[PDB]
Amino acid sequence: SFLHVGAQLGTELFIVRQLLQIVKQKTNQNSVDTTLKFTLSALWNLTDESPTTCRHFIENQGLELFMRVLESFPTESSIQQKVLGLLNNIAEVQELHSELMWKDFIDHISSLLHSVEVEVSYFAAGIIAHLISRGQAWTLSRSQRNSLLDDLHSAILKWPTPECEMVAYRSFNPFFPLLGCFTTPGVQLWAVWAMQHVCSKNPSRYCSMLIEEGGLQHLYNIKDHEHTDPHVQQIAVAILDSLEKHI
Amino acid sequence: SFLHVGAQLGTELFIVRQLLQIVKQKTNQNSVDTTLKFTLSALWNLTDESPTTCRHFIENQGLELFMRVLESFPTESSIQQKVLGLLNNIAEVQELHSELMWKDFIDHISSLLHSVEVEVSYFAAGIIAHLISRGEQAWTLSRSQRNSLLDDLHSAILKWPTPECEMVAYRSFNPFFPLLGCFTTPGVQLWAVWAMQHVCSKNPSRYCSMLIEEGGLQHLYNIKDHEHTDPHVQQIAVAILDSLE
């Protein structure tokens, strides 16, 4: 049983509010705790493919609090990873691209792109790619826009093969618009690198999902559009020549 | 994106633990805040049709905490309602039966069984019905209290006025159907059909079609043509049927 019909969304948003409360309080104590990491993971999971909870997170000034946690734990790679994963989920929601147009946020993301932990800079790069995705809606410095595109492209190619699988996905759909951005080599470079990574680590899961959602097409279109970045093209053909073996 | 595969289960159980922490906090303080009852509703909803988070609730001392909530706020309508609703969700899980066989627990539930605010006695009755529905040997406590409760349940339901606004909601009637077959213990049957009738009379657009699609017509109707059935139970059952037509 439960209280009444439709009562679960209210409790979901209430849970988001209370998790933000625990984040704020653990930040005030400077307590990198097991419960703090669990709370950041919970927030990250709840924002997965749910723009309503992303909007509730933003409307409860969650991103300001996440800037604060980034600044109060500058060396904690796990904290940064979970924070940036949630912020990536937000960067995927087009209706809220407006409220990530804030230079303190963009500055912290650009700084975290140069982390020597690929588990951190990967999500920094994802945020960056999904923000440059929108052509300009830029609302800020075009200096910083061009700078961060170039930095995206360089940083991706400086990445090693990760040890674990740094992330999970239930759908490759948010990657498909980033694959058509032939104008922005870094964005599709991040997309192709991430898909390659997840199928290389977990083919059992993501090969079937990548083919079923029609992504082999986006890859094949990149394959011989002659206005393609050699690096993006090489990653695309590698993904194809691995996904072709698996039916 | 999310942390890793299967992380959603860990996140949900962590949420259960933290909500229980908020409950213990606002019970140590005698603070009946908005967030306390919202936490109670959140826990209640998370326990709906999910044996897993109910098991986690029990494993995180949730039973003792909830009865501390009961003993510290004996006048609070919504608080007792939500507590007893979550415990009703626990009671429908057979594997956790032995956990609810606590003496003080059954005592408090039998006390709240006789409360006149139906929003409370209803869920207390649900707990007791599900408990003694599982047989005599399964009752590891005072059998005197068991065979007294299967009468006090019957009596408490007959004295019930019909509720006003939304008291409860269900996603499926499947936990009720095993109760409908307890001809040996007619209080269980009577609670089951009374609940079905109430929810089908206030929200017929949802619940009667749900009841038919889940095949409850056949159980109510078995009660119909099963002779030697309790007269109150039979009355309510044929009543549900005659407009389920």
From Swiss-Prot, chain A:
**TM annotation in the entry:** none
Q: What stretch or stretches form a coiled coil here?
A: none
Q: What is the effect of changing W44A?
A: Complete loss of N-degron binding
**Outcome of altering N89A?**
Complete loss of N-degron binding
Where is it located?
Cytoplasm
Q: How is it modified after translation?
A: (Microbial infection) Ubiquitinated; leading to proteasomal degradation in the presence of herpes simplex virus 1/HHV-1.
Q: What is the effect of changing N45A?
A: Complete loss of N-degron binding
Stated family? Belongs to the zyg-11 family.
Quaternary arrangement and interactors, per the entry?
A: (Microbial infection) Interacts with SARS-COV-2 protein ORF10.
Q: What does this protein do?
A: Serves as substrate adapter subunit in the E3 ubiquitin ligase complex ZYG11B-CUL2-Elongin BC. Acts to target substrates bearing N-terminal degrons for proteasomal degradation with the first four residues of substrates being the key recognition elements. Prefers Nt-Gly but also has the capacity to recognize Nt-Ser, -Ala and -Cys. Involved in the clearance of proteolytic fragments generated by caspase cleavage during apoptosis since N-terminal glycine degrons are strongly enriched at caspase cleavage sites.
User: This protein is called what?
Assistant: Protein zyg-11 homolog B
